[PDB]
Amino acid sequence: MHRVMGIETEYGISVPHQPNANAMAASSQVVNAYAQARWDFELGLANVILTNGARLYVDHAHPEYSTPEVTNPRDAVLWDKAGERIMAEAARRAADLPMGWTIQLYKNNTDNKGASYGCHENYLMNRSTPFADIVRHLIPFFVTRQVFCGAGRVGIGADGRGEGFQLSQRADFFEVEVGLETTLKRPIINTRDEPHADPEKYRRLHVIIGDANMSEIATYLKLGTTALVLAMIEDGFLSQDFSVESPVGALRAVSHDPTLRYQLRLHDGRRLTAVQLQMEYLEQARKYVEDRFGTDVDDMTRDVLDRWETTLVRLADDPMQLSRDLDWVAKLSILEGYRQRENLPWSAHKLQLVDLQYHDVRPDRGLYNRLVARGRMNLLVDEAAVRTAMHEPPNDTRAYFRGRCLAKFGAEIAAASWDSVIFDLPGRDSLQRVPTLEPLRGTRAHVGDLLDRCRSATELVAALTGGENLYFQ
Template identity: 45%
Template sequence: MPLLGAETEYGILAPGLPDLHPTVLSAAVVDGYAGTGTRTRVDDDGSIPLEDAHNRFLGNGARLYVDHAHPEYSTPEVTSPRAGLLADLAGDAVVRAGAQAAETQLGSPVRLFKNNTDGKGASYGYHENYLLSRATPWDRIVAGMLPFVVTRLPLIGAGRVGLGQRSEQPGFQLSQRADFFETVTALETTIRRPLLNTRDEPHADRGRWRRLHVISGDANRSETSTLLKLGTASAVVSAIEAGVLRPVALADPLGAVRTVSRDLDCRARLDLTDGRRLTALDIQRDYHAQVETSGLGDPEVLALWASTLDGLDADPRQCGELDWVAKLDLLQSFRRRDDLAWDHPRLAQLDLAWAELSDRSPYHALVRAGRMPRLTSDAEVQTAVEQPPSDTRAYLRGRLVGERTARIGAVDWSWLTLGSGRRRLRLDDPFEGTEAAVQSAGGLDAYLASR
């Protein structure tokens, strides 16, 4: 399984403070988070602090920062899809706590949204990161990932009211992001968005690893959708890396992503370059079968992947544990009850409120009513908020940030500086600095002395 992590860009709004710049608002959220983490500090020698208050590393190994006028949370590096799910949910809890502090400071409500579009033309990302061996050729990654990211929308779509980047046409589609892709591969993430992003910053020894930066996925509320998103992609990345995947090739990937996103019955057939026409679910089944045959992937995820594909094949409406299905069911219920057309503002309101990190979100109402299953406990999420993962360098980073805060000069993913002498500790191998390594060295200080 590849090392993985995810970044969530949260939409933000202070409805009572329309003149407050969103960057200032986002900074109040980042600064307001009271958990352990780096802070702005004036160094002993009066030099300019290396750490910025709006760019914090936290005691759980994550990074919380202001990016493009919104708060962003990057999970620590983890080694399993379930740990990825917990780290993702920990991010929601952290920014929510930051927003509550910002509300107190500003004296006005602060809303955060875990979605990917404001419905008015702006899109912001949920980025998955997978670490692969440098030996894996980029062409093989593109061939393996492209049909996968297009056909996974029935599993991971968050659901969206509105068709077109500015919701020009009324209606509903599976994905928040589908209408924002304009090219197949490219380096950019904000203009001419590609289905596959070529950014390769492994934050590790470049000679050994490369990074796959997947920007095409939705930010999910459903824990099932998040686990499937991270777990199925991890399995496919493993198969690509191992050279065992024989992927199909889509004739028109960009057209297909729009087709799949608008296909509420999951029955549309997509043209392949070999002349065959398969549904998104057919292609996902092919990926699943190849990964399973190869003995790769997380067993929990493989079972969930298969049962979810069975459910979607039988009747998508039965899959209420998935974001888009549950959201659509709710919207259709309101449409029937109150005779609402798809362009009625209350449906757009429900869509937006679904993403709001607030107990009043319809998502939470479904959880409370027992209609939306959770896969984690509050206690597990709280642990992921407070403690770093044990089996990557995020363990060392988190413990140093949390317990030796005053000694930290600067932090980045693959290094940090310690003490007034600015000793630089390199962490180019993301699998070092683990709990086991620190313990076998005799504790944190002994480990640092040994490096």
């Protein structure tokens, strides 16, 4: 599988029993107590680039982590999970600042009281792909992918006043089909196109509808299945019309029926459950890969297709058999356990606590993390690789150059962004901006040996001068 992608995750943040803390100060403490280079904006809040190529910054009232650019869904999982470890460590380091605040961080999307915050997916696409096709084919996919993507939520309605359990935290906050908004009146398809790359070649698709996932299987399926659907859209492969009546109403109705029986009404007359509509996308993705690649299909594409199909078959048979793989199922398994053990209504405060603490980043207190510790969740990557990904960038995108420069020449990096690194060299009145405009250049194959041989940032900038259209574009 090969498509440039990344995940940005806004974390919930709590500072109990500090009546004079505010979310902005607490979020700044998290970012500043971890780290590094400043973000190149060309207030300016706490806002840094890490040696793994990631962004760590304050986005209004939340600390946010953005993965380096990666090329496949396994690597997206790996560097996204590294973000959870970075957040947990940053909060631990903040406790040692003079202020002494105990800061709790949650990889979720709502306070169950009407506020939502985002876990965004980003995908690089051909600029030539007509946007009407992106909209028409992605809306029904996004309405239904929560059957395996959802993180689960206790409470129905944006304000949480309705009693019950639903598949997704985000669904109640989406109100329109297409638009620019990310904080209110949220659209199923967000239309911002800011690729940090050559806009004559590339569109960046900015997806905002997904829940943050703890489960690595869920994150893998979310990014990997979406990437397969994007490949079909780019190639004009989908001849069917999957459009549904009232897609915003359908998104919420699908979320509000965890029995998975609610039927969408397609414009072509069909009545399909969300699982059934997902199986239609899966069948097309299988035909597409067979038609295009035949035996040239790579193992990861094969693995995504197999896990997608297996998950959908098990969801239609008995969703509770997926309690080791999907967040909403694992969470529901705990929730129903307490409901049976203690005869609790869906309005019980203990059930709200389980819903939130599932996403706590602490290894010793977060409920997902306790499930992993007791061997009750399937993993996709191993912890040693996650730890390495906290500090080292992917090898096959421009994040390699960005992260390796920061590790080796950190003192002489004035700032960095997705599309440049700014050097401050000893004895120069001017900053040296090295553009990194192509996401698939600046990789280890391009600059790795050069970086190895260079002993100072002055030597590197010298070796790169006039070679921009070789190493980076």
